[PDB]
């Protein structure tokens, strides 16, 4: 006998034709929701492609395999993303779909959403852990596919938004957001119009945890803003000694000059952070450095009455 096979075929065709009620009557009368045609296409594939959200939901509640792949390796999530069905994308992810499934060519759902500039879908995929730098067997990334189809400006908008959010998270000290943004593709070395990078902000506002994360992820420890200030300049001014150390342990230049000629020692002796001076001195800070006014860090320590600092600098 072959009643089960007969029901499966009728279900596939009812789904292929967008006959929601016919699909659900067949299901109610025993049709196998995990049936598949010659190409491995299942009913869930067809509902995800056609955008029939109600059918996607009931199929999943009836045990449809959310990650079923056809002969080319497409899952329902691949189709939902390629054909621009945001709600279905969200439902499949809620039901355990592999966000980073690969087809035979190695393309992920994020590849396909990026290709058409479906920004809302791109962002949900990244929120669920989509591999932002994934490459297919030919080395093409989601950004590459967007550019090839004239949608690069939409990917640049994504990156601009991630850049804004990373700077905000680094300035406000939100460790968890920083990590999730970096993993979603945020450029750790992005800078605003005045050359301030996330590391500048974290070091200035005293967010040690984020300084370590940014450096581990490749932030330039000696990046200079518009005024020539490195993160060590700002940390020395604000008085964050643990950050001063970390920056030095990661290769910060102790004698970096801003535009006025100030080294971190100029700024620390001025600010009155004695131990910072001692750490800088221990790390080879040049006590003889003169700024644009010909003044040394010793000259600045006097002008602030930090005789303890002006005494150790003498030694």
Author numbering: 8 to 322
Any passages from the paper?
In this paper, we present a strategy to fuse specific, high-affinity protein binders to obtain multivalent or multispecific scaffolds of predetermined geometry. DARPins are used as building blocks to confer the desired specificity to the construct. The two helices are not just joined end-to-end, but instead the two domains are made to overlap in such a way that the joining helix is stabilized by contacts with the domain cores along its entire length.
In these structures the ligands were lost from the complex at acidic crystallization conditions. In the off7_H09_3G124 structure, residues 141–156 are clearly visible in the electron density map, but the angle between the last helix of the N-terminal DARPin domain and the H09 connector substantially differs from the design. DARPin repeats carry a conserved TPLH motif in the first helix of the N-cap5, 23, and protonation of the histidine residues in this motif reduces stability and weakens the binding affinity of the DARPin moiety, leading to the loss of MBP and GFP from the ternary complex.
